Amino acid sequence: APVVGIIMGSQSDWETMRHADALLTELEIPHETLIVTAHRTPDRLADYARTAAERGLNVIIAGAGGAAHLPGMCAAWTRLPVLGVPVESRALKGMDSLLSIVQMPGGVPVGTLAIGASGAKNAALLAASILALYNPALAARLETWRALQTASVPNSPI
Amino acid sequence: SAPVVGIIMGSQSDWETMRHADALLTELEIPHETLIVTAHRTPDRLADYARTAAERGLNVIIAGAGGAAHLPGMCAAWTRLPVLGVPVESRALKGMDSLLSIVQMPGGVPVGTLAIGASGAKNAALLAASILALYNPALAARLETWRALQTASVPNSPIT
Amino acid sequence: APVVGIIMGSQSDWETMRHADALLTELEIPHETLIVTAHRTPDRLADYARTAAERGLNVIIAGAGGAAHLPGMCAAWTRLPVLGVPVESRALKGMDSLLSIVQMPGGVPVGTLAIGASGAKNAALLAASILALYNPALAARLETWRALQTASVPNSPI
Amino acid sequence: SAPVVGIIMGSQSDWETMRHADALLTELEIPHETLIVTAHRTPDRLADYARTAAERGLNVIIAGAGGAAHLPGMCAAWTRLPVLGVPVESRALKGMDSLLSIVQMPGGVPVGTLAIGASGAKNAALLAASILALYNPALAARLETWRALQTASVPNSPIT
Amino acid sequence: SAPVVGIIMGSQSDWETMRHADALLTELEIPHETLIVTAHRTPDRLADYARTAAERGLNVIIAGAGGAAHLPGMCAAWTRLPVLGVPVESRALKGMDSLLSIVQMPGGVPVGTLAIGASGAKNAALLAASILALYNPALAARLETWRALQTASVPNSPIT
């Protein structure tokens, strides 16, 4: 049963959000990966977010670009931690994505990651760090992952 | 006297801006309602408001919000009515976050966006009036008079 | 007889504004699609805007980029609703387009849509939503269009 | 004493900025007129002003506006005279909307743009003077004297 | 009563912002510590704090900084715990430098970033609470009550 949900507004976002999916798979974290759009399927979004906790989800990772409302509206309907990935937009390079996700008024948080692929990977890692607080086997796998990241850095450029 | 325009905003702090929309609709004698609806703290209230707007007889919705401003966009997701968005000026980013959060809607769900701040609130009311005037001759006459007086009221030179 | 006018400053804008044209055609809304430039044909613009209402136009959709003055000057000469599409510019990616269209001082409104193709499509949809207020057959077609948009969203990425 | 420069602005609020252009033309003894012309509220007034400027004997137009600042650009569309644009500082976006709305003219219709705010108004007057000085020897002499005094007036060190 | 959240900031000037995180953790009865740790002036203090956080029993770190804001990112480099970052508003660039310095972490080392300023500090505390509530039923109940009261406290219309 999934403990993280990865959701995104459209197929075009998958180029970005696949990096989150891959990282959860590497760390062997059960998850579901779905399309949910705030603007085109608002009722789907409401149902998804409001039932997330009772379905056993622990963390939601949401990616969107442009006027990016998916993470914020997800957080409006759930008490679960919601992590937001600004997807790079064509004209404004994800600056619109970033501001529309991170600038949540007080009371309804979205933990926001970097624009683009880096943010998708880091949303998965941040989700893993949250789950590791109460899953010792995963905490060990995450320690190994971070140790390998550090150890594998070369000493000089090629 | 049933409302044909709804003015909605996320907070009392938004009223400082949205009051200009309210005043202009009153000036033009357009029946309206003015409410607080917040996308993030009352999302079910927003869904209900937007999805029943047409059946309640609303023709246009004017929505104002600042920061990560999601109220206009989520309103438009739930209604076929035209939704006009007013970016409310934010403290740190001067409404640039408000503007981009509102205007940059992906294709399929429009929000007609006006200027940051009081100017945008006034123009949202005027744009709503222009829409209503298409099928209300008396209002069309009031609006043309309003625009004509605006033009006639412009002085020819500045006061030193 | 056209009830929406789509106008743009140059042939290069057509790559963007064709999305508005296509959407009005899909919804079977009679329209005209023309080149009118604020800076190179200002008298053409004045004549077009000031006679729009008496020609039977209900809404004008205007696209321009850079120092984008076409929507604002159109609105100066007509009481019809004017919708503005910021066309993506080469250097500043339509940020100049966006600010020069949306930041109208109070008294003369332009309802502004997103930079680029999305904005062109949405200007046509917003025009349709305006016309639907007093055209029941169109209102039904627009409802169908929005219902299909919502219903056709897949549940997961490929 | 017929004007050779026209200073135009959209509103009385612009005068706080454009007064610096007016003062500098007066200092240099350049005959000018100072008027309010708004692109959006008096578009026919603007068309008439711009299209008759050359025949009225104007040589240069200095135009100031803020926000979606269209006055300089639309002026240039209707005249062959050089048009200089002053971006007036706006409240929310600090004149960045003013600047981009003025300077980013597509090829074919120029506006020579100066700095945001009072500095730009002063420099628009000085640039106009530089243009006129090309075919007015007395003014050329006054302008060179003005620039020379500017340079000579710079102190060698700051006051603590 | 041992702390499970650490709130850290680079300077006393940051406290004006970070106090909102501290207040909210107290409201929700979450044991925490509040400290000054600066990335640039006490880098060894930061390394020691971050690398011992987990063994000291901390579950979440909330870090605030402005300008070239490196404290959250360098904290995350030294710990496996979730690190939440609060961009503190800077004088010249209004926290845009703070925001980009914090949120734009390269892949491999996450910082969950909140809004510029007081809103972000409040939300960092709430996000930390949401994380802790996953494995603390009493806190989960307090947090749901908190969110429910927030929603219920929203008025239906503005005060004119």
Place this chain on the structure above:
Amino acid sequence: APVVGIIMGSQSDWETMRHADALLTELEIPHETLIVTAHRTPDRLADYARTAAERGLNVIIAGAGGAAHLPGMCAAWTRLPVLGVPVESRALKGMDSLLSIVQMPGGVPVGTLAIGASGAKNAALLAASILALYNPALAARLETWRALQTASVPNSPI
């Protein structure tokens, strides 16, 4: 003898400044086109600007990108009108170019045109409009040029 000088900091700027050169040629305005860099040939710049008037130049058009100082420093050394063209830079797309040219403190003006090719063309046109004030034959050719620009705009997109 040249009455307009077109100067630029490097060969890479020519892709942009060639549009100014072409326009002056079309209008049959005698000009010179040169490389002068503020940062690498500062003494060349000082000599060029300070002798411009006595050499018979009427207007200088200066293009530069990045920290773009060429127009401003030219204006510091001459009483002639100086027109500045922000050249599009690789990273910041000429926003650095634009701000470093247009934001001249009061006392030393640079008339600034748009980023890129449009600005180069318009600097040449603005120079022509200045010269036309006291050259009737050129004024007529410029009127013809502007009339053709206006007249040649098509009525609809292809």
Place this chain on the structure above:
Amino acid sequence: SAPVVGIIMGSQSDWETMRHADALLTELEIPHETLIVTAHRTPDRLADYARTAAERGLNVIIAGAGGAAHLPGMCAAWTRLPVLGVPVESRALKGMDSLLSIVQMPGGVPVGTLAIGASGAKNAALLAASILALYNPALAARLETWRALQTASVPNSPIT
């Protein structure tokens, strides 16, 4: 007591910022001169100052300017000495024009750029001190002591 650092600025208004560089050099007992040199109003003064700096015994130049800030860059064009640039905060664009005008030097002519405003002025002095300390042991000792006291002066927690 001959100066080894020159602090230059375009205007008296810049002194509010550049005074912080002056104070720090004095604290560290580094002989210096503090002058007004403007790129646009005294370009020959600037050329002479920069091109004679090395022969006059200067080792480092600290230059501050705002807006279209050309003083640091043009200084570096005329000298082989290291030139450090301080972006002075501008009214409209908050020093973003100052920053980009200074830091974005094309390859071949460097300006080492510091933060917008007072922080940058202080750091320009400290960076100059770091450069001089490479070949002055007494100053190297004073600078290490200065940095050590900075670190030791950081409190462990904020004052509520």
Place this chain on the structure above:
Amino acid sequence: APVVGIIMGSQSDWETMRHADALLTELEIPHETLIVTAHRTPDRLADYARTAAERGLNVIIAGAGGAAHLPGMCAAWTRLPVLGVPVESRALKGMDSLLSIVQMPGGVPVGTLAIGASGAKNAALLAASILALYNPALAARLETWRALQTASVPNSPI
């Protein structure tokens, strides 16, 4: 023995930082070129910076992109002058790089150069100008380098 250290966070930065390496080689300045990342090898960074002076380094040139912390954290651990090169990032074109490097609060300086290749070249030149203060042979070679830069500028575009 190296007197300048060039460090960067990853292999992808080498495309940029190679310009610094080439310039130091041209001026015959002994240097070392290494990978050190603030976020993935923070202990490596601490050791590198804190021992730099005693190893005989005089200047450190550090390049990083995105949330770019490498130069600032290097400066935190050394009294040596640290020069920072903002590497161009994919989405925000190095504006994030630039602000996260240059906006150091008072007390810990980083001398910042332009975004990208230009900044890498100039960091090497600025390092050379620092070293030239107390190395006469290098000072002469740097004078020659700058003289050739100035002298080799063509008089007109091709």
